[PDB]
């Protein structure tokens, strides 16, 4: 589904992360019990993991 | 269980949130499917919610 980032997520540098700025809209495809969700900001480019905590309905 | 903060969590100013610095040791008492975990720092005054994504083994 589609979510908007409710917090900034600069990340750590990990290539597995998807850095977010608050307000960014992205498509989440998977949500894992570790507390991470896999998303793609909407052009089809960059995919990676973001905190589920930070995803608000859009 | 006991964890360590894997990332800084400044939060939004919400009274529900427990701001963290990376490396902070926290005891989590609840973990909810929304992606948030409730706990208290080893110091152990204020309890509040943090991203489950940011919890790692200490």
Q: The domain spanning residue B5 has which CATH number?
A: 2.30.30.40
The DSSP H or E segment spanning B19 is: none
State how far the Cα of B13 lies from the Cα of B18, in Å rounded to an integer: 9
State how far the Cα of B43 lies from the Cα of B34, in Å rounded to an integer: 26
- Residues of B within 8 A of A48 (CB-CB) are none
In a mutational test of the B interface, the residue from A16, A17, A35 whose CB has the highest number of chain B CBs within 10 Å is A35
Please report the resolution in angstroms.
1.4
Q: Report which of A26, A21, A32, A31 is spatially closest to residue A47, judged by C-alpha positions.
A: A26
Q: Which residues pair with B5 in a beta bridge?
A: B55
Structural domain range at position B12? 1-58
Q: How many structural domains compose chain B?
A: 1
Helix/strand/coil for A6: coil
Q: Which residues pair with B56 in a beta bridge?
A: B4
Q: Report which of B42, B33, B54 is spatially closest to residue A31, judged by C-alpha positions.
A: B33
């Amino acid at each position: 589904p589609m979510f908007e980032a409710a917090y900034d997520f600069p990340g750590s540098g990990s290539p597995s992360e998807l850095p977010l700025k608050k307000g960014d809209v992205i498509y989440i495809t998977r949500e894992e019990p570790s507390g991470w969700s896999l998303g793609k900001l909407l052009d089809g480019s960059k995919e990676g993991w973001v905190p589920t905590a930070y995803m608000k309905p859009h």
